[PDB]
Curated annotation (Swiss-Prot), chain A:
Subunit and interaction comment: Dimer; may exist in other oligomeric forms.
Residues of the full protein shown: 81 to 177 of 260
Location of this chain's protein in the cell: Secreted
Site for Required for dimerization, residues: 47
Record-given protein name: Irisin
Amino acid sequence: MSPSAPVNVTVRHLKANSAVVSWDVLEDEVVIGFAISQQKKDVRMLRFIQEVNTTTRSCALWDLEEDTEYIVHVQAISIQGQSPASEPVLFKTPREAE
Amino acid sequence: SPSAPVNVTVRHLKANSAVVSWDVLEDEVVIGFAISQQKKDVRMLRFIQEVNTTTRSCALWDLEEDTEYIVHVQAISIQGQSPASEPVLFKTPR
């Protein structure tokens, strides 16, 4: 069996080249990690981050493109399995300062 | 068949961040990488990968100061994934 997809996935502290992703899970007692997928709306480069044996509920994304739209999906990892993708979170980075 | 990345090194070593770099023996078949990251005092296991990129480096952010970490790199190629580079142990300043 497996955990439920992550809920309330939000994007905070969104900067020109970085952002932080947060979420919640329904079963905190079963979730040991997470897997995140990142790709630009204009897909090309695909970035994947996974962390296990942690209690974290946020993951930073660095070296993002300025004035660019991204699509991130979060998944929850259990000791027995993994959950389906959360709902896609979409966002766009601010412009580079001049 | 894809060869393990070599010359894996840590640069711009800072209290909370660093950059890992490597070279590969077959630039032509390589399209990405997989980096494994953990503390020497194992707890949280972090795994990163990028596909369809020509980069030869990856920044590691939000590291704890005065802490030892162990990382290794794997090449992602059009002929599968390489075995892992030799592990690299480094310590963040204070």
